[PDB]
Scaffold this motif. Sequence first.
Motif, PDB file in Angstrom:
ATOM      1  N   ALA A 132      13.374  40.242  33.922  1.00  0.00           N
ATOM      2  CA  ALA A 132      12.308  40.727  33.046  1.00  0.00           C
ATOM      3  C   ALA A 132      12.870  41.679  31.998  1.00  0.00           C
ATOM      4  N   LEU A 133      13.814  42.534  32.415  1.00  0.00           N
ATOM      5  CA  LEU A 133      14.371  43.449  31.404  1.00  0.00           C
ATOM      6  C   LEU A 133      15.094  42.644  30.332  1.00  0.00           C
ATOM      7  N   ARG A 134      15.882  41.655  30.742  1.00  0.00           N
ATOM      8  CA  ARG A 134      16.488  40.734  29.785  1.00  0.00           C
ATOM      9  C   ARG A 134      15.458  40.085  28.877  1.00  0.00           C
ATOM     10  N   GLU A 135      14.323  39.644  29.436  1.00  0.00           N
ATOM     11  CA  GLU A 135      13.369  38.988  28.538  1.00  0.00           C
ATOM     12  C   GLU A 135      12.766  39.983  27.559  1.00  0.00           C
ATOM     13  N   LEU A 136      12.911  41.281  27.838  1.00  0.00           N
ATOM     14  CA  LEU A 136      12.324  42.290  26.956  1.00  0.00           C
ATOM     15  C   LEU A 136      13.270  42.826  25.889  1.00  0.00           C
ATOM     16  N   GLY A 137      14.531  42.395  25.823  1.00  0.00           N
ATOM     17  CA  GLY A 137      15.467  42.898  24.838  1.00  0.00           C
ATOM     18  C   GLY A 137      16.766  43.473  25.366  1.00  0.00           C
ATOM     19  N   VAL A 138      16.809  43.875  26.631  1.00  0.00           N
ATOM     20  CA  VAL A 138      17.916  44.559  27.264  1.00  0.00           C
ATOM     21  C   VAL A 138      19.004  43.616  27.768  1.00  0.00           C
ATOM     22  N   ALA A 139      20.242  43.858  27.365  1.00  0.00           N
ATOM     23  CA  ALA A 139      21.434  43.294  27.967  1.00  0.00           C
ATOM     24  C   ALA A 139      21.716  43.917  29.337  1.00  0.00           C
ATOM     25  N   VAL A 140      21.736  43.049  30.335  1.00  0.00           N
ATOM     26  CA  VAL A 140      21.986  43.412  31.714  1.00  0.00           C
ATOM     27  C   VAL A 140      23.129  42.553  32.265  1.00  0.00           C
ATOM     28  N   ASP A 141      24.186  43.175  32.761  1.00  0.00           N
ATOM     29  CA  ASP A 141      25.314  42.504  33.380  1.00  0.00           C
ATOM     30  C   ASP A 141      25.169  42.418  34.899  1.00  0.00           C
ATOM     31  N   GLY A 142      24.885  41.211  35.382  1.00  0.00           N
ATOM     32  CA  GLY A 142      24.920  41.000  36.824  1.00  0.00           C
ATOM     33  C   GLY A 142      23.492  40.818  37.309  1.00  0.00           C
ATOM     34  N   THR A 143      23.282  40.124  38.419  1.00  0.00           N
ATOM     35  CA  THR A 143      21.901  39.911  38.883  1.00  0.00           C
ATOM     36  C   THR A 143      21.603  40.651  40.184  1.00  0.00           C
ATOM     37  N   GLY A 144      22.498  41.550  40.603  1.00  0.00           N
ATOM     38  CA  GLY A 144      22.340  42.338  41.822  1.00  0.00           C
ATOM     39  C   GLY A 144      23.285  43.533  41.805  1.00  0.00           C
ATOM     40  N   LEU A 145      23.204  44.428  42.777  1.00  0.00           N
ATOM     41  CA  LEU A 145      24.116  45.563  42.855  1.00  0.00           C
ATOM     42  C   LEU A 145      25.563  45.107  43.027  1.00  0.00           C
TER      43      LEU A 145
END
Length: 424
Positions: A132-145
């Motif tokens: 969801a953060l990705r769909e909102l504009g944010v670059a996020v590396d990785g899908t878990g801790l």
Amino acid sequence: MKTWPAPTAPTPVRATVTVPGSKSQTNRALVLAALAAAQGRGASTISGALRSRDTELMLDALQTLGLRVDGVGSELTVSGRIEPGPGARVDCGLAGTVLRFVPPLAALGSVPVTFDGDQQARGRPIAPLLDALRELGVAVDGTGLPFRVRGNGSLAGGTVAIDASASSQFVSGLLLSAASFTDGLTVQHTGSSLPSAPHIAMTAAMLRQAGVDIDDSTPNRWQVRPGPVAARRWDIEPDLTNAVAFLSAAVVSGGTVRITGWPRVSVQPADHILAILRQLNAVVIHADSSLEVRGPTGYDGFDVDLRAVGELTPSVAALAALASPGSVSRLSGIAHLRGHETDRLAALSTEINRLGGTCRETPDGLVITATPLRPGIWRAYADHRMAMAGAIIGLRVAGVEVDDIAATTKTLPEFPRLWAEMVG
Ligand SMILES: C[C@](O[C@@H]1CC(C(=O)O)=C[C@@H](OP(=O)(O)O)[C@H]1O)(OP(=O)(O)O)C(=O)O
């Protein structure tokens, strides 16, 4: 580590207990206080704040993002701005509220921020909120801790669909920061089984007390308008989930236990809690701003739906195990407990059966038949509530020891002392 012997109660418990602040409300106040500060509205104070491992991970989390959080006892002050330094790295511990509430906040920084947590925390749901953060504009590396939120100093917002069947904190964490997104946010929960409705409501109520406009008039949908977060003073209520562990002692012993400062109108699920207790024929009275519960001389098996109040499951299972011989009790609505601190349905089942009991996991809960129990080692799984449930059992079964009573520090560092004092 030595074990902790759970004191028995061969006679009715009689006591007055004070439990410290609510975890859920404390950590929500800290996040809201950080947004106010980052927006330039000044410092906020939280009075009656819980000091525990979960709230210390939250405030260190805010300090990692650049804010300043002071205080020595239950009074904390938040100030400063969001501005993470190079190599910034949030330790989430086993605190879901930090794992879920702080990455959105981090999207306001213009520097990268890593999220990490205990080995046991990497088994807890997080991927849907990162998407969801990705769909909102944010670059996020990785899908878990461990993952990284590589923010850009602000966040557009907009509309987003998410499946939050695994945790209500996916919604709360999105809602808490929405007011600082350019367009604000509209969030839609897809599908069904949305657990812990009272905690999403808690978020909404506290957002309104900070002057934020949120529309929750349609089930499974929330609209939040972009706008100021108010700098204000927060007053924290006693934690009612932890109070239930002490109240449970009145119930199983035929005793009387009072809780000081019980709110007459709370941001917590007090109504659900008192109903459950009365299902077992406890007498519950409001008196002296305190809540008094009088346990019955005995009680039989019960059927209870815990979907809205899943964190009560460890204490209510213990109550079910201590019902009259041969009683059958059914706990429902709690499949999502398979992803809590530990898998709480598997663990409760294992530890009750170890004591010679009869508890069976179901697709959405537990079925428990009251049968004579014997001494043993009740394991906590690093989970504050497994540990308190061991203490409840011990009141009525000689020979029970919890392996790691210090697990209680997540939300109640002083449990051992408070518990000794009650049973005395
Ligand atoms: C599980 C626990 O408590 C939870 C606190 C929480 C909140 O937003 O403050 C919402 C719920 O989560 P879910 O919808 O995911 O069940 C609660 O069960 O703690 P946690 O913050 O580490 O996840 C607890 O106290 O037992």
